[PDB]
């Protein structure tokens, strides 16, 4: 199970760290401290008939 909030993910640190999500086609503000956050997609399909 995922559990409760432990890290503050939205301390911007006085930075204006815009990222443009090419997926959502929108700008988001990253925190000042997160190392990376990126929006490239993978899709995996497994399909079985018996």
């Amino acid at each position: 199970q995922f559990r409760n909030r432990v890290i503050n993910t939205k301390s911007f640190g006085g930075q204006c760290r815009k990222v443009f999500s090419g997926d959502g086609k929108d700008f988001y503000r990253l925190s000042g401290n997160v190392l990376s956050y990126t929006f490239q997609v993978k899709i995996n399909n497994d399909f079985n008939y018996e």
């Binding site: 930075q15 000042g32 401290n33 997160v34 190392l35």
Partner: protein
């Protein structure tokens, strides 16, 4: 008086089909400048903390 007739018919049919595709598209390419690269503030922080 003895009379006997027999007829037997059997058919067996088997089909196997397979397909694989691997298709790869390039739409953007780039080259970085050699010098004066503006490092991320997170990276600068990491380095200065060293």
């Amino acid at each position: 008086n003895s009379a006997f007739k027999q007829a037997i018919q059997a058919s067996h049919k088997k089909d196997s089909s397979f397909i694989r595709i691997h298709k790869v598209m390039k739409v953007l390419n780039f080259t970085t400048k050699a010098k004066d690269l503006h490092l991320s503030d997170v990276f600068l922080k990491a380095l200065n903390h060293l």
